[PDB]
Write a protein that binds this ligand. Structure first.
Ligand SMILES: *[C@@H]1O[C@H](CO)[C@@H](O[C@@H]2O[C@H](CO)[C@@H](O)[C@H](O)[C@H]2NC(C)=O)[C@H](O)[C@H]1NC(C)=O
Ligand SMILES: *[C@@H]1O[C@H](CO)[C@@H](O[C@@H]2O[C@H](CO)[C@@H](O)[C@H](O)[C@H]2NC(C)=O)[C@H](O)[C@H]1NC(C)=O
Ligand SMILES: *[C@@H]1O[C@H](CO)[C@@H](O)[C@H](O)[C@H]1NC(C)=O
Ligand SMILES: *[C@@H]1O[C@H](CO)[C@@H](O)[C@H](O)[C@H]1NC(C)=O
Ligand SMILES: *[C@@H]1O[C@H](CO)[C@@H](O)[C@H](O)[C@H]1NC(C)=O
Ligand SMILES: *[C@@H]1O[C@H](CO)[C@@H](O)[C@H](O)[C@H]1NC(C)=O
Ligand SMILES: *[C@@H]1O[C@H](CO)[C@@H](O)[C@H](O)[C@H]1NC(C)=O
Ligand SMILES: *[C@@H]1O[C@H](CO)[C@@H](O)[C@H](O)[C@H]1NC(C)=O
Ligand SMILES: *[C@@H]1O[C@H](CO)[C@@H](O)[C@H](O)[C@H]1NC(C)=O
Lengths: 46, 256, 99, 82, 360, 113, 50, 99
């Protein structure tokens, strides 16, 4: 009921632009780059 | 001598961006000023009246609401003024504005108005009203119907004062309500203090001398003001050259 | 273990909760409800009571926005540090001790 | 208004606090510029023959033609920020 | 400023230099007409509260001092303006509203008041400015058998608007049953007369109420006080009074094409750039007088007691004088020789003690 | 002012009103009939306008933040109801951020993941 | 309350200031996420035989 | 391209404009002009009106100083970063990834 009470008085929580799935996908991309390519992918081509 | 001579037909047109006036008497240059006032909304429904006299009562009295935007493409001699009031008879006060070639007479009395009032041309007001008693206001000044030419007026009745705004435009080969901006300028503020709920336009008719009056036509546009917030653009010389209606669409609301 | 993120969530929720609690403060007016003031008082005194409520609520909202700005600055500094760690620890090998 | 100042005196050292805070920000800005740019105590100058083994630094070195003594890139940067 | 007897080396902001105005100019309309307050306040008969009389006052110069000089006005209460300052102001929208009410109803002639005559007879707006005058009229508006000439609207369907008069003598329906314009059970006439008798004590005696209504500065003014117009001066810091508008500035010629209705000129921030005068219809550009901050550049009091002053953002001609981009520096001698910064002045200029020198 | 929905809350006989954690009314007992109603205030939303430059076009889209589409080219996003943009299954870079992974661009105005 | 809004309008652009500040914080949070996580422009994938 | 620097200029000018614009706010008083209040009211009530104006303007000025302090902290962090880049990228070769 905390969220509803805050919402009723004009306070709104805007959703984050990047969802949890997309942030997880970014971490997955960083892990794949660091595992298969080492540090090369951060400085140019993987 | 009240005679019914004018028949009136009506159509509906778009206001476009007409009807902007200077909301106060303050010079502002090269600024964007947002003001809330009684304005004619952009692209609003405006009634086009054609009044024809050929040589029964078919010229009803229009409501006033919160203020009236008036426009005409006719020459300065055909439309000669207006009538404002509630009952339009001797029991309440009424405002009569009559223009002629030399000056304008604005006069608030207890006029017993005719059903189809018109000034007939010397000029006689015996067809406008039958009696005028207990007259409480008179104001004579230079005329505002002078000499293709679009004539725009804004009438407001706010807290005792009847404010009249006017602009003239050299229109040509375009629909009578043109595009672009022509801000109307404050012409007179009259300390009237009467109740106005209905209004009517005065036309001039010529005697025939041959079907007692010469056949004639007058076309005019009437729109109604609404409480609206406008954002006006004042250019380098203080002229309102552009405006956005804050509540017309989301794009203009974003601009506002 | 995950106290830092939980603290961020807790602080944000607590700030919102406090801001809602501020609506139930009279601030030196007859009532904290605007409807009660409108229904029980004529406009001369109603303007004064609503003025007291407006100034108190506006002060509360300004306080909340200021706290949010300071916390946003702190989180921005933490995010800049996190981006620096992402660039220098994940995308490369760092010779900085304890970074 | 003198009467307003007399009434303002009842509020205390708010004015002094605001002036002190703004003064701190004002000196801080100069300190920021000193920290970023004044990191050399010798004003080095380039040799008159601008040959560096094929490397061209005309766009970043100062332009003698301009009265401002700025580089073409710096001149562009100054024009683009208003 | 530093609340210490020893001042360390540095530049310190101490005060603000501002050139003071030299003389006061009052510009008022030349037109002088004695204002007809005698007609309103000394009238033998007043109107009823339902049909209250409104008189417009315009194009006159009003001396309110005589209102005080002769005055049976038991109540003289002003809402938006001081009584003694009325002679120093210019007004438009002046209206005198005269009516007769009860002794106990004088509290209801106020903005926001709850009452019978407040709702159905005479309504004041919430933003009302002006003065309410109330005085006992037992000697003139009372008769021994009962003076019933003054009537009030007891019943009406809805509350009135501010400054609206209702004189319609139609019947009111007070019950479920329609009345159809004929009196009878639960059908009463709206207008009832007051039973004013001299035998009653204060509080029920007839009271004459006159409401003076004004508007403040939102239109060109036509009613002004007895203050005399002074001449206009150009290019000097003066404290001017244009139609009740007081300001301190320099009045200069303007090249702004004002429209004929326009008077005031406003800049981007609504600051009054220019003004027009009623007596002479000309536009005077208004610019605030020269001012700036004073900074005292000083070495330590341990070293010396010499000081230099920097007027920030002020050219040297409006106050060892050196002009810098930071402002005008008084007390330091510019030296071509370049040294490290000791006391920062600004725009590449620094000051030091060797006398106080200023250098790049 | 609010919607009065059916309530599953079992009041004790002496109680008349109901309150939230944040001391806001969330329930009420009807005086005429002893029934419990969940007072829920009417829907509100933050109207946001999505537009490209006026130099390019004057078409706009409206996002009602937090509002389901049934309570107001209508698309439902987790951010709210987007009116005036057509959902495209193609994925592009973000041009105008909408939220919850949705971005908008002008090509008409399209909304995409 | 319309009367409250009318009284609130006398205070100026406080509401605009607060909305602007919160909007700045709101865009800043998304910017923070982009700075930390969106540091690669290619979505790399691991081989099937891990 | 030069959006960051222009943004700083934009914020500062806007803040000053807001601070100047707040002078046109009645703050619950009869007028926003002090000269009118003095020219129109007696000291017992003019003191009240001037008090309302003083508290509103003082609150506006404190708000401006608070946001100036927060922006000063943000710009100071950016300047410290710029000094670090000048020391490590210009005055030497850096092995920090993406710095
Ligand atoms: C135009 O209107 C003016 C004003 O009503 C007329 O001038 C008046 O004429 C009457 C004659 O009936 C005189 O008694 C007034 O003294 C005049 N007043 C002014 C201000 O001049 C004028 O006659 C009208 N002209 C026409 C052609 O109708
Ligand atoms: C270094 O680069 C500059 C500019 O990039 C070169 O100057 C150009 O010279 C050519 C031929 O002389 C002209 O057509 C261009 O207009 C010049 N550009 C500018 C911006 O002035 C210069 O030639 C290069 N080499 C050396 C040795 O300075
Ligand atoms: C204008 O009003 C008439 C009737 O009042 C209506 O039939 C017509 O559709 C309106 N015009 C527009 C453009 O909506
Ligand atoms: C209005 O006229 C009628 C008849 O001429 C008269 O009885 C009445 O008193 C008049 N009223 C005013 C206010 O002049
Ligand atoms: C104005 O006149 C109309 C028509 O009789 C009436 O219904 C209305 O109440 C009047 N307005 C006022 C404010 O008296
Ligand atoms: C404004 O006035 C100047 C000077 O009379 C004139 O040259 C110019 O055409 C006018 N209009 C605009 C839009 O600048
Ligand atoms: C007021 O009226 C009385 C008669 O009632 C008269 O004697 C007196 O002279 C009048 N005074 C003024 C100032 O008109
Ligand atoms: C008096 O003022 C009027 C304007 O109200 C002006 O037209 C007139 O010229 C002035 N008289 C003199 C003698 O200047
Ligand atoms: C009140 O009246 C309603 C309607 O007749 C009825 O249902 C109810 O039982 C009554 N009593 C109480 C205690 O509500």
């Amino acid at each position: 009921d905390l969220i509803c009470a805050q919402k009723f008085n004009g306070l709104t929580v805007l959703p984050p632009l990047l969802t949890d799935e997309m942030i997880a996908q970014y971490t997955s991309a960083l892990l794949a780059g660091t595992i298969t390519s080492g540090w090369t992918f951060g400085a140019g081509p993987a | 001598q009240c005679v019914n001579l004018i028949t009136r037909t009506q159509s509906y047109t778009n206001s476009f961006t007409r009807g902007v006036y200077y909301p106060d008497k303050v010079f502002r240059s090269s600024v964007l000023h947002s003001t809330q006032d009684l304005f004619l909304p952009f692209f609003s429904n405006v009634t086009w009246f054609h009044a024809i006299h050929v040589s029964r009562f078919d010229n009803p009295a229009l409501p006033f609401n919160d203020g009236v935007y008036f426009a005409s493409t006719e020459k300065s001699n055909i439309i000669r003024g207006w009538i404002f009031g509630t009952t339009l008879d001797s029991k309440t006060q009424s405002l009569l504005i009559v223009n002629n070639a030399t000056n304008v007479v604005i006069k608030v009395c207890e006029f017993q108005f005719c059903n189809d009032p018109f000034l007939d041309v010397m000029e006689s007001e015996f067809r406008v009203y039958s009696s005028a008693n207990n007259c409480t206001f008179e104001y004579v000044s230079q005329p505002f119907l002078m000499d293709k030419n679009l004539r725009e007026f804004v009438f407001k009745n706010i807290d005792g004062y009847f404010k009249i705004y006017s602009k003239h435009t050299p229109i040509n080969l375009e629909r009578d309500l043109p595009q672009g901006f022509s801000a109307l300028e404050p012409l007179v503020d009259l300390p009237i203090g009467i109740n106005i709920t209905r209004f009517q336009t005065l036309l001039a008719l010529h005697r025939s001398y041959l079907s007692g009056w010469t056949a004639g036509a007058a076309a005019y546009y009437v729109g109604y003001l609404q409480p609206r917030t406008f954002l006006l653009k004042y250019n380098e010389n203080g002229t309102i050259t552009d405006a956005v209606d804050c509540a017309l669409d989301p794009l203009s609301e974003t601009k506002c | 273990a995950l106290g830092k993120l939980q603290d961020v969530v807790n602080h944000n929720a607590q700030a919102l909760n406090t801001l809602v609690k501020q609506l139930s403060s009279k601030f030196g007016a007859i009532s904290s409800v605007l409807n009660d003031i409108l229904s029980r008082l004529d406009p001369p005194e109603a303007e004064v009571q609503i003025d007291r409520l407006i100034t108190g609520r506006l002060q509360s909202l300004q306080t909340y926005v200021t706290q949010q700005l300071i916390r946003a600055a702190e989180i921005r500094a933490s995010a800049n540090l996190a981006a620096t760690k992402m660039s220098e620890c994940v995308l490369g090998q760092s010779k900085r001790v304890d970074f | 208004s003198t009467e307003c100042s007399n009434l303002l005196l009842q509020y205390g050292s708010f004015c002094t606090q605001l002036k002190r805070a703004l003064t701190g920000i004002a000196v801080e800005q100069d300190k920021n510029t000193q920290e970023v740019f004044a990191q050399v105590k010798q004003i080095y100058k380039t040799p008159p023959i601008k040959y560096f083994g094929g490397f061209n630094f005309s766009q970043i070195l100062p332009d003698p033609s301009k009265p401002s003594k700025r580089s073409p890139i710096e001149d562009l940067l100054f024009n683009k920020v208003t | 400023t530093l609340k210490s007897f020893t001042v360390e080396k540095g530049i310190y902001q101490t005060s603000n230099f501002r050139v003071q105005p030299t003389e006061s100019i009052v510009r008022f309309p030349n037109i002088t007409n004695l204002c007809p307050f005698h007609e309103v306040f000394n009238a033998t008969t007043f109107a009823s509260v339902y049909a209250w009389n409104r008189k417009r006052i315009s194009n006159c110069v009003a001396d309110y001092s005589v209102i005080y000089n002769f005055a049976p006005f038991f109540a003289f209460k002003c809402y938006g303006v001081s009584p003694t300052k009325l002679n120093d102001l210019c007004f438009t929208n002046v209206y005198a509203d005269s009516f007769v009410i009860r002794g106990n109803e004088v509290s209801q002639i106020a903005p926001g008041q709850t009452g019978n005559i407040a709702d159905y007879n005479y309504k004041l707006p919430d933003d009302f400015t002006g003065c309410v005058i109330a005085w006992n009229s037992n000697k003139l508006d009372s008769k021994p058998s009962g003076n019933y000439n003054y009537l009030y609207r007891l019943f009406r369907k809805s509350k009135l608007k501010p400054f609206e008069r209702d004189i319609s003598t139609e019947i009111y329906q007070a019950g479920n049953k329609p009345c159809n314009g004929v009196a009878g059970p639960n059908c009463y006439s709206p207008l009832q007369s007051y039973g004013f008798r001299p035998t009653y004590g204060v509080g029920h005696q007839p009271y004459r109420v006159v409401v003076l209504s004004f508007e403040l500065l939102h239109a060109p003014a036509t009613v002004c006080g007895p203050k005399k117009s002074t001449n206009l001066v150009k290019n000097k810091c003066v404290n001017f009074n244009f139609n009740g508008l007081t300001g301190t500035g320099v009045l200069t010629e303007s090249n702004k094409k004002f429209l004929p209705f326009q008077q005031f000129g406003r800049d981007i921030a609504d600051t009054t750039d220019a003004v027009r005068d009623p007596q002479t219809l000309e536009i005077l550009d208004i610019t605030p007088c020269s001012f700036g901050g004073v900074s005292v550049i000083t070495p330590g009091t341990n070293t010396s007691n010499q000081v230099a002053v920097l007027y920030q953002g002020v050219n040297c001609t409006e106050v060892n004088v050196f002009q810098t981009r930071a402002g005008c520096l008084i007390g330091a001698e510019y030296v071509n020789n370049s040294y490290e910064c000791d006391i920062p002045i600004g725009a590449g200029i620094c000051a030091s003690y060797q006398s106080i020198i200023a250098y790049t």
